[PDB]
Structure 1
Amino acid sequence: IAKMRTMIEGFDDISHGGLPIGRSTLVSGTSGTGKTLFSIQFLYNGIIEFDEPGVFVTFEETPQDIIKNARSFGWDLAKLVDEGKLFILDALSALIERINYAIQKYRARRVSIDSVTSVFQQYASSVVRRELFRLVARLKQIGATTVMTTERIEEYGPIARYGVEEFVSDNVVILRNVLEGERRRRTLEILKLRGTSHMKGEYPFTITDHGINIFPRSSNVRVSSGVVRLDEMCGGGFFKDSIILATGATGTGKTLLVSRFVENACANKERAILFAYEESRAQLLRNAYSWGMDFEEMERQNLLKIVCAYPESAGLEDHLQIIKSEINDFKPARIAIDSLSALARGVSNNAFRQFVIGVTGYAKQEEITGLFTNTSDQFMGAHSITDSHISVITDTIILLQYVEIRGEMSRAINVFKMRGSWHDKAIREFMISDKGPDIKDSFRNFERIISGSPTRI
C-alpha cells in the first residue's frame, strides 16, 4: 500500500510516509479541533507542491467562507480555483456521481469532504453505516485518496457520532482538544491504518499562521559561561552543543548566571535568546544593570532577544512553537529558559517530560547551547536533582545550594555532573556583588553541607 505525502510537519513521520493511496481516511474530532483546516491543508499542500488535481466537497459552509477562512494562513485557494487546480463543490448517490464527475473533470489525486456527519441529519446508526459504507466503496472504485471529516461529542468517548464510521473507514485519525486545569491541549492520533504501519498514541500539535504543526555531531568545542572560575570548575567552560542546567532555591543566582551566559554570547558578537517566564523586561533590565550588564545595549546590537510571557497563559505545546519560531527567525548561537519550573506548575509530568525532550532535541539538532534554570522545591538541592526527571536529560548540572554558616545565610556553587568532560567536585562558596559572582574556596572544615545546615569538623 503506497502512501501520499500531505507536507504536514509531523504527520508525514507519524503515518510512516503519509496517507494510504486509493483509500479513504476519516479525521474525526470535537468542534474547533482543526478538522476543516487539516482537510484544506491536505488539498492545498497536495497541488501546491505535486500539482495533482483535488476537489473539496462542502455542506453547511459557503465556498467563499472556506477561501476567506483559509486566508488566515496566507493561502490563495481562489488563485488555485482561477487555474482549475482546486474545485469547491457546494452541498444520496447524486453527490457520488457529481464527485466522480468533478474528480475525472480534473483527473483526481486528493479529495476532502467537510462534513459527512452534517449530511446525515435525516438518516440512524445502521442507516449511516449502509450509506457511509456505500460512499467509502464508491471512492476506492475510482482510486482517489479522500479525507472524511466526522463530528464527535466527547474527547474520550465514541470515535464518531453514531459509532459505526470508524469500522467502515480504512484509516481513522482522531483530532482532540482536551481541557485539563482550564488549559486546552490539541493532540492528534492515528487509531488504525489498514494494510500499513503508523505511530500509536496521541501527539501534541498546535495551529499557527503556517497551519497544522504536529510534533512527533557531538563536537568537543567549548563555549564560556561568563565566569572564569565556573569555566575552570567545568574544565574549560561548557560544550557548544550541550544542555546546561542551573538548579537551586529561590534567590540563589540562577537568573544572574543566565544573564552572564547570555551576555558572553553578545560579548563574542554571537546572537542569544532569553525566554523569561518569572520576571519582566522592566525588572530584568534593572537587575541586569545592577550586576554591570547593559541588556539594553545587547538588544541595540541585535545580538540579544528577550521574550517574556506568563507560563499559565499559553499551553506547553504552544510555548515550544513560540521558542522554535523565535529560534528559527533570530537564529541564536545560545538560548536560556528562566525557568522550566515556571512552565511545569499546573501541567502533567508526562506533558512536561515531552516538552524538555522537544526543546533539548531541537536545541541540539541546531547546535544551540541551552542554559535552562529550575527552582528546587526542597532546601537540600542534592535531593531535588534526584526527584527531577529532566536532570537525567541535561548533560551538565550547576547546583546552587544555600549554606547556613555562623548564623549567616551564605550560598555555595558546585558542578554536580559534566558529561564526557572532567569537572571540579568541590562545593565552592560564592558571594554576589555589583560585578556579579565571586566563586571563592570550598568549605573544608564543614560536614553535612549538602543538607544546607552543616557542622564544624
Structure 2
Amino acid sequence: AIAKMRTMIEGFDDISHGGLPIGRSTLVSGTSGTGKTLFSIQFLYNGIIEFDEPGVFVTFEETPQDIIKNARSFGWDLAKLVDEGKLFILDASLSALIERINYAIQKYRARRVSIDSVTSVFQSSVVRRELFRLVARLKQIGATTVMTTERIEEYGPIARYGVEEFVSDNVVILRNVLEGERRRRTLEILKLRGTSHMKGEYPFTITDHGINIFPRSSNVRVSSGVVRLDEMCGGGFFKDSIILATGATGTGKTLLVSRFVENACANKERAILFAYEESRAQLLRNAYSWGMDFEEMERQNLLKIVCAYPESAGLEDHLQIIKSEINDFKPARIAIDSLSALARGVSNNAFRQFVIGVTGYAKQEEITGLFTNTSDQFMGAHSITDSHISEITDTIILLQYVEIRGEMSRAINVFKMRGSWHDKAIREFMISDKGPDIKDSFRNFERIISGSPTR
C-alpha cells in the first residue's frame, strides 16, 4: 500500500483518497490560467505551514519575486517563508538542473518539490527520454515533486507532446471548459499508480483562500411564519429539513420566503436571504407592503440579504459564495429565491450537482432551507414530476392559480412532508397587508390541479 501526503487543499484530500503518492512525482496539466501554478505553490505553502516540511520551488519562466507578488493576493508571505529557510525558489528561467535540484533538496532537507511549466524545459521522441530521466532522479531523492505541464485543447492531448502522461505515475488534469460564454473550473485525477482515487471531473473555484475543490435527523420543528401553514405541516417544518415552494409567477414564493425569514428574526435567530430575481431595494418595499420591516432585522444583525443575477457568476461560484456567507454569518435558517433563476441557461447535470451541494451543506449544519422554484407549465403539479430536485426536498409547498368564476384565485397545499402528517387539501388563500390568509378548500370544484376547476 502506497502512503499519501495530505496537500491540505480543501477537497483534494478526499478526491485522491488521502493525497498524492509519497516519493513519487504528480503531473498537473491544464490550459493557461487553470491554476497549475497556484496548486504547485499552495501544495508547498501548506506543507511548510501544517507538517512544517521544507519545500523547493523550481521556476522556468517568471522570476522568483513575481511568484511571491502573485501569491501575495491569497495572503501568503513567501519572502517570510524564504527568509526562515522553509522555502527555496530555484530561478531556472538537463542533468545540470537534476544535481542543482538534488543538492537543494538535502541543502534544505525538502520533503515537497514543485517544477513550474516543465513544458518550457523543452522549447516528442526527446521529451519522453528527458521527462523519464527527471521522473527517475526525483524518485531516487524520495521527494514528492509536483510537475506542471500545459495543453492547447480542454478535451484533447493530456499534455503538449501527448507523452507526459505515460511517463508520470500520477496525472491531475486542470480544465477551464467554456459552455454558453461561462467558464467552469473543473479538476479531475486522471490516474494514481499504486492507490485508489475518485474518477470524473469535480467543480472547483479560486478565491482569496486559494483553490476550493468542492467534491442527526432531529424531530425539532420550526415555524414558517404562518400559523395555518404550521398546522397544515403538522406543527411547522423540521429544523434540519429542506422545504420547496413551487408555483407559477406571482403565486407568493417570495412572500413565504420573507415570512419564513421574518419568523427566524422574531425568535432572535440569524437568517440569510439569497435573492436572484428581485433587488434588496424592491425586496424591502414589497416586504414592508406585507407588514414586515426587513431593514429592522438587518439592524438587529439577525437577517442578512445578498441579491445578485444568476447569469452573473457560475454555479460553482454561487455555491462557494453561499457556503462562505453561511460560514461567516452562521445563520439558523436560509432561503434561496430562487432555484429556477439559477437553472436558466445551465446544464441539468451542473444544476442537479449544484442543488446537491446546498442541500447537503444546509442539512449537514442543522440549517432549515426554503428553496423556491417557478413552474414552467400552468399545472404546477406536472412541473413537480419533471423537477428532478423534488427527490432531495423533504417538504413540498405547491402554489397554484385556480380559475374561479372568471377570477384568478390562489390555492396552497402541502404536497408532501417526510416522516410527518400534513393537511392533504388544496386550501384557497388570498394575499393582503401584514401578509397572506389561508381560508378553506374548494370541495365543490373538480380538476383543481389543472388550474381551471369544474363545478
| Aligned equivalent of 1:52 | 53
Give CA deviations for 1:316-375 in whole Å, capped at 9, x if unaligned. Answer: 000000000000000000000000000000111000001110000000111100000000
Per the TM alignment, residue 214 of structure 1 is displaced from its structure 2 partner at its CA by 0.3
Give CA deviations for 1:355-405 in whole Å, capped at 9, x if unaligned. Answer: 110000000111100000000001000000000000111000000010000
How many angstroms apart in 2 are the aligned matches of 1:440 and 1:376? 23
How many angstroms apart in 2 are the aligned matches of 1:376 and 1:156? 36
Per the TM alignment, residue 104 of structure 1 is displaced from its structure 2 partner at its CA by 0.6
Give CA deviations for 1:302-327 in whole Å, capped at 9, x if unaligned. Answer: 00100001100100000000000000
How many angstroms apart in 1 are the aligned matches of 2:191 and 2:230? 52
How many angstroms apart in 2 are the aligned matches of 1:401 and 1:142? 69
Give CA deviations for 1:93-112 in whole Å, capped at 9, x if unaligned. Answer: 10000000000101120000
How many angstroms apart in 2 are the aligned matches of 1:208 and 1:133? 35
How many angstroms apart in 1 are the aligned matches of 2:61 and 2:18? 32
Per the TM alignment, residue 118 of structure 1 is displaced from its structure 2 partner at its CA by 1.1
How many angstroms apart in 2 are the aligned matches of 1:64 and 1:13? 33
How many angstroms apart in 1 are the aligned matches of 2:147 and 2:284? 52
SS of the equivalent of 1:73 reads coil
How many angstroms apart in 2 are the aligned matches of 1:454 and 1:442? 12
Per the TM alignment, residue 194 of structure 1 is displaced from its structure 2 partner at its CA by 0.3
How many angstroms apart in 2 are the aligned matches of 1:111 and 1:376? 53
How many angstroms apart in 2 are the aligned matches of 1:78 and 1:141? 29
SS of the equivalent of 1:63 reads coil
How many angstroms apart in 1 are the aligned matches of 2:228 and 2:110? 67
How many angstroms apart in 2 are the aligned matches of 1:251 and 1:31? 45
Tell me how large the CA RMSD over aligned residues is.
0.7
How many angstroms apart in 2 are the aligned matches of 1:24 and 1:6? 13
TM-score normalized by structure 1? 0.99
Give CA deviations for 1:119-172 in whole Å, capped at 9, x if unaligned. Answer: 1119xxx10000000000000011100100000000000000000000000000
Give CA deviations for 1:248-305 in whole Å, capped at 9, x if unaligned. Answer: 0000000000000000000000000000000001100000000000001010000010
How many angstroms apart in 1 are the aligned matches of 2:359 and 2:395? 13
Per the TM alignment, residue 4 of structure 1 is displaced from its structure 2 partner at its CA by 0.2
Per the TM alignment, residue 115 of structure 1 is displaced from its structure 2 partner at its CA by 1.2
Give structure 1 regions of 4+ aligned residues with deviation exceeding 4 angstroms: none
Give CA deviations for 1:12-48 in whole Å, capped at 9, x if unaligned. Answer: 0000010000000000000110000000000000010
How many angstroms apart in 2 are the aligned matches of 1:272 and 1:351? 27
How many angstroms apart in 2 are the aligned matches of 1:2 and 1:47? 19
How many angstroms apart in 1 are the aligned matches of 2:111 and 2:418? 51
Per the TM alignment, residue 224 of structure 1 is displaced from its structure 2 partner at its CA by 0.1
How many angstroms apart in 2 are the aligned matches of 1:284 and 1:394? 25
Per the TM alignment, residue 437 of structure 1 is displaced from its structure 2 partner at its CA by 1.0
How many angstroms apart in 2 are the aligned matches of 1:79 and 1:355? 39
SS of the equivalent of 1:56 reads strand
How many angstroms apart in 2 are the aligned matches of 1:219 and 1:338? 26
How many angstroms apart in 2 are the aligned matches of 1:149 and 1:253? 52
TM-score normalized by structure 2? 0.99
Give CA deviations for 1:63-84 in whole Å, capped at 9, x if unaligned. Answer: 1000000000001111000110
- Residues 36-185 of structure 1 aligned to structure 2 (within 5 Å): 36-91=37-92, 92-121=94-123, 126-185=125-184
| Aligned equivalent of 1:11 | 12
Per the TM alignment, residue 219 of structure 1 is displaced from its structure 2 partner at its CA by 0.2
Give CA deviations for 1:182-216 in whole Å, capped at 9, x if unaligned. Answer: 00000000000001000000000000000000011
| Aligned equivalent of 2:228 | 229
Structure 1, unaligned stretches of length 5 or more?
none
- Residues 248-327 of structure 1 aligned to structure 2 (within 5 Å): 248-327=247-326
SS of the equivalent of 1:186 reads strand
| Aligned equivalent of 1:433 | 432
How many angstroms apart in 1 are the aligned matches of 2:399 and 2:435? 15
Give CA deviations for 1:409-446 in whole Å, capped at 9, x if unaligned. Answer: 11100000000100000000000001211000011000
SS of the equivalent of 1:151 reads coil
% same residue:
100
How many angstroms apart in 2 are the aligned matches of 1:86 and 1:394? 49
How many angstroms apart in 2 are the aligned matches of 1:310 and 1:296? 21
